[PDB]
């Protein structure tokens, strides 16, 4: 008829308040014969023999609730772990009260640990509530702590699953270093300015000093950290105007202990209304049997419903944390902490105090600086990308067309040849053609400059397993775009299902089908329906570009896998190699798009296309994810579609014949 | 597949009847294969306002008036695409290559 409560507490005043709350816990519960005894222990400068003394004293005491209430620990590890582990050896709930580490969030590791505080990742949820107020969609994550970094990124992806958006850049590395400045300069080149930081005080002061040396406290920069990053020398290195968080009654020890005693007491008086009430035996000497109502009492703690307390309502969720906590939002006004907001269970209310920013105005900084210099990557398309070496040094020969129009070239940068032939010989030459003048029209339309460069290979890009770690990766223009080295694939890119799963698309500019290049008895093929090409031989040589999207499109078509096993013996790197081989009568057929071969038939009259016109598809501009260059650019493309500018581009190259 | 059509009796009253009719063709097969793949539930009916869409003093008509004013969800049937229609709603990717032409003898 007795219940023991164990605690690790040092100060005699909080021990007296703890014993007074234990004595007053049986006040309003009538004249029932239950008794509540309390046992508190102090601290030894070590941690192993502390764990030993506490664990065997609470085994000999047979307590039901174990409390740790020491925020000023001299060790910066903040680990009450071994007492909770020894209680989890017999499945006894330990109620942690001070630390907020996410490693305690794992119920698989911490089988019988509960706490009345949330981890810091929920603060990012509050920062997700910052995404619901100021209409922000691109963040920059920086976490040094690898113990909580995976859980923080998992919670971040869970929060961004509702919007189905992704973070722009995430970083995890070893704490204690000082060169993170190159990563900060790479973050400077990004569009967003949202700085999310999750580390200790040393790494926070290091990145504050690194941002102060780079002078990242200008206009548009978003600064948003927590309570751990505004203490110690990080408070000395703190730039003004920074927006931080504050835990309401997180440091207030006495009311937290009183609320914990109320929660434990009402949980015990709820558990006394049930049967199958087992007791943990003397497990120190000759008793390794587990406490049989471990998960039962844990489920009793799962259904803990409350309506009274000092601060607010307390309830344990599927993770065992405190919900609906009130937070404070502080601002650093000239190295002075000024409160600028309050936070309810789910809602933010800024007060009448102004929001002073480190940059310019007091309104929200529109920190999405879009790319005004687009790194344009392209592949060498023969009717679209005409590449010519310069005359003397970086100049373009302004040749005139037959319509009185000078050719508007561009200084592109490209290699000589492929990697076995020419490994690294990249020069700036002059590029012009269809998509070059299309990009010139886009630059005339919108507010941007650009940077035209080429791709290192002659391939679009296919998904293939890299030989280490058994992972499928990309290459080509998709491999260079997703690496961040490029900005916009301006190329006749093959639109299919697999590419749209990873990036976003625009409206297609080119619309054409598929055909067969032959040379001119039926010398023609009449498309795919030739029965001699269904079961091929060494006579009719049909082939395609190596690592092309037509190969993937025919790889999905499992009913013509024999053509998949036939073109693999004759895969060519570029289409110009196929033109050179079919002019010298080494090839016999070539699956390729319609209008390119029609232009080559206008070049050379012996080139003949086939009769069947299948897979009438469209080619557009390769794009990034959700970006401010999506809606404006698609409206500009549609404006180019509605007028006769497509006919003008036909008059440049397509409609003209030779 | 069945559908309804709100056919009015006269011009004297606005009261009509929802006559149920059958439909087949291209877009019917497209919608049936979408129901095979996605495995959802659809609510198919016909519009009685008129043609595709035309704004008369910030008032659209037809399928544009049904979709933009949110009396429906999506337009599966045939619809031309221009600038302001792409401004008011979000079209999908194009699947069929249908332009304009001139019929002569």
Swiss-Prot record, chain A:
Q: Which GO terms describe its molecular function?
A: amyloid-beta binding; calcium channel activity; calcium ion binding; calmodulin binding; enzyme binding; glutamate binding; glutamate receptor binding; glutamate-gated calcium ion channel activity
Biological process, per Gene Ontology = adult locomotory behavior; associative learning; calcium ion homeostasis; calcium ion transmembrane import into cytosol; calcium ion transmembrane transport; calcium ion transport; cellular response to glycine; cellular response to manganese ion
* Compartments it resides in: Cell membrane; Postsynaptic cell membrane; Synaptic cell membrane; Postsynaptic density membrane
Arranged from A to Z, the UniProt key words for this protein are: Calcium, Cell membrane, Disulfide bond, Glycoprotein, Ion channel, Ion transport, Ligand-gated ion channel, Magnesium, Membrane, Metal-binding, Phosphoprotein, Postsynaptic cell membrane, Receptor, Signal, Synapse, Transmembrane, Transmembrane helix, Transport, Zinc
Report residues binding glycine: 492, 494, 499, 549, 593
Post-translational modifications: NMDA is probably regulated by C-terminal phosphorylation of an isoform of NR1 by PKC. Its phosphorylated state is influenced by the formation of the NMDAR-PPP2CB complex and the NMDAR channel activity.
In which tissues or organs does this protein occur?
A: Detected throughout the brain, in brain cortex, cerebellum, thalamus and olfactory bulb.
How the protein is activated or inhibited is described as: NMDA glutamate receptor activity is potentiated by Zn2(+) in a dose-dependent fashion. The potentiating effect of Zn2(+) is at submicromolar concentrations and its inhibitory action is at high micromolar to millimolar concentrations. Excitatory glycine receptors are inhibited by D-serine at 100uM.
> Key word Lyase present in the record?
no
What is the stated purpose of this protein?
A: Component of N-methyl-D-aspartate (NMDA) receptors (NMDARs) that function as heterotetrameric, ligand-gated cation channels with high calcium permeability and voltage-dependent block by Mg(2+). NMDARs participate in synaptic plasticity for learning and memory formation by contributing to the long-term potentiation (LTP). Channel activation requires binding of the neurotransmitter L-glutamate to the GluN2 subunit, glycine or D-serine binding to the GluN1 subunit, plus membrane depolarization to eliminate channel inhibition by Mg(2+).
In its UniProt entry, what is this protein called?
A: Glutamate receptor ionotropic, NMDA 1
Give the organism the record lists. Answer: Rattus norvegicus (Rat)
Encoded by which gene? Grin1
UniProtKB/Swiss-Prot annotation, chain B:
Task: List all annotated glycosylation positions.
Answer: 10-11
Give tissue specificity per the record: Detected in brain cortex, olfactory bulb, hippocampus including the dentate gyrus, striatum, thalamus, superior colliculus, inferior colliculus, midbrain and cerebellum (at protein level). Detected in brain cortex, hypothalamus and cerebellum.
UniProt subcellular location: Cell projection, Dendritic spine; Cell membrane; Synapse; Postsynaptic cell membrane
Q: Where does L-glutamate bind?
A: 78, 80, 85
| Family stated for the protein in its record | Belongs to the glutamate-gated ion channel (TC 1.A.10.1) family. NR2A/GRIN2A subfamily.
Free-text domain note: Contains an N-terminal domain, a ligand-binding domain and a transmembrane domain. Agonist binding to the extracellular ligand-binding domains triggers channel gating. A hydrophobic region that gives rise to the prediction of a transmembrane span does not cross the membrane, but is part of a discontinuously helical region that dips into the membrane and is probably part of the pore and of the selectivity filter.
Protein name as annotated: Glutamate receptor ionotropic, NMDA 2A
Residues represented out of the complete protein: 434 to 538 of 1464
């Amino acid at each position: 008829k007795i219940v023991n409560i164990g605690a690790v507490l040092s100060t005699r005043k909080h021990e007296q308040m703890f014993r007074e709350a234990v004595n007053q816990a049986n006040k309003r519960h009538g004249s029932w014969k239950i008794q509540l005894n309390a046992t508190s222990v102090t601290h030894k400068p070590n941690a192993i023999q502390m764990a030993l003394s506490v664990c065997e004293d609470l085994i000999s005491s047979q307590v039901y609730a174990i409390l740790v209430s020491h925020p000023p620990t001299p060790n910066d590890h903040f680990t009450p772990t071994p007492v909770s582990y020894t209680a989890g050896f017999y499945r006894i709930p330990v109620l942690g009260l001070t630390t907020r580490m996410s490693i305690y969030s794992d119920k698989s590791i911490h089988l019988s640990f509960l706490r009345t505080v949330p981890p810091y990742s929920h603060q990012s949820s509050v920062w997700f509530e910052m995404m619901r107020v100021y209409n922000w969609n691109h963040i920059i994550l920086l976490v040094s702590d690898d113990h909580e970094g995976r859980a923080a990124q998992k919670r971040l992806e869970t929060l961004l699953e509702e919007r189905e958006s992704k973070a722009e850049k995430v970083l995890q590395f070893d704490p204690g270093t000082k060169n993170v400045t190159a990563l900060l300069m790479e973050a400077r080149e990004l569009e967003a300015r949202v700085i999310i930081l999750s580390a200790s005080e040393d790494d926070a002061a290091t990145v504050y000093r690194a941002a102060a040396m780079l002078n990242m406290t200008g206009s548009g920069y978003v600064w948003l950290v927590g309570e751990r990053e505004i203490s110690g020398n990080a408070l000395r290195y703190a730039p003004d105007g920074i927006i931080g968080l504050q835990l309401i009654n997180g440091k207030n020890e006495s009311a937290h202990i009183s609320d914990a005693v109320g929660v434990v007491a009402q949980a015990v008086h709820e558990l006394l209304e049930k049967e199958n009430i087992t007791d943990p035996p003397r497990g120190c000497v000759g008793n390794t049997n587990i406490w049989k109502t471990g998960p039962l009492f844990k489920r009793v703690l799962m259904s803990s419903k409350y309506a009274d307390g000092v601060t607010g309502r307390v309830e344990f969720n599927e993770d065992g944390d405190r919900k609906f906590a009130n937070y404070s939002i502080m601002n650093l006004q000239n190295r002075k902490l000024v409160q600028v907001g309050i936070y309810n269970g789910t809602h933010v209310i800024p007060n009448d105090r102004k929001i002073i920013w480190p940059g310019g105005e007091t309104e929200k900084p529109r920190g999405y600086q879009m790319s005004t210099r687009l790194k344009i990557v392209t592949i060498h398309q023969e009717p679209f990308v005409y590449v010519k070496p310069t005359m003397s040094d970086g100049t373009c020969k302004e040749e005139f067309t037959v319509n009185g129009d000078p050719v508007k070239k561009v200084i592109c940068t490209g290699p000589n040849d492929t990697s076995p032939g020419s490994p690294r010989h990249t020069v700036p030459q002059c590029c012009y053609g269809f998509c070059i003048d299309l990009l010139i029209k886009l630059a005339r339309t919108m507010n941007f400059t650009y940077e035209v460069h080429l791709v290192a290979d002659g391939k679009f890009g296919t998904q293939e397993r890299v030989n280490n770690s058994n992972k499928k990766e990309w290459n080509g223009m998709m491999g260079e775009l997703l690496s961040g080295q490029a900005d916009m694939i301006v190329a006749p890119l093959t639109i299919n299902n697999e590419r749209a799963q990873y990036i976003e698309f625009s409206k297609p500019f080119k619309y054409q089908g598929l055909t067969i290049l032959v040379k001119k008895p039926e010398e023609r093929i009449t498309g795919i329906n030739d029965p001699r090409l269904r079961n091929p031989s060494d006579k009719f040589i049909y082939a395609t570009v190596k690592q092309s999207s037509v190969d993937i499109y025919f790889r999905r078509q499992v009913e013509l896998s024999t053509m998949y096993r036939h073109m693999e013996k004759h895969n060519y790197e570029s289409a110009a190699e196929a033109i050179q081989a079919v002019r010298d009568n080494k090839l016999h057929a070539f699956i390729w798009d319609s209008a390119v071969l029609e232009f080559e038939a206008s070049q050379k009259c012996d080139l003949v296309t086939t009769g069947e016109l299948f897979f009438r598809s469209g080619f557009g501009i390769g794009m990034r994810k959700d970006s401010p260059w999506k809606q404006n650019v698609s409206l500009s493309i549609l404006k180019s579609h509605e007028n006769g500018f497509m006919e003008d581009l036909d008059k440049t190259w397509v409609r003209y014949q030779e | 597949v069945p559908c309804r059509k709100f056919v009015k009796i006269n011009n004297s009253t606005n009261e009509g009847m929802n006559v149920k009719k059958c439909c087949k063709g291209f877009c019917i097969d497209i919608l049936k294969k979408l129901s095979r793949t996605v495995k959802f539930t659809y609510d198919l009916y016909l519009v009685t306002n008129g043609k595709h869409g035309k704004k008369v003093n910030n008032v659209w008509n037809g399928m544009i008036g049904e979709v933009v004013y949110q009396r429906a969800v999506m337009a599966v049937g045939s619809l031309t695409i221009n600038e302001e229609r792409s401004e008011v709603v979000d079209f999908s990717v194009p699947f069929v290559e249908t332009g304009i032409s001139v019929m002569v003898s």
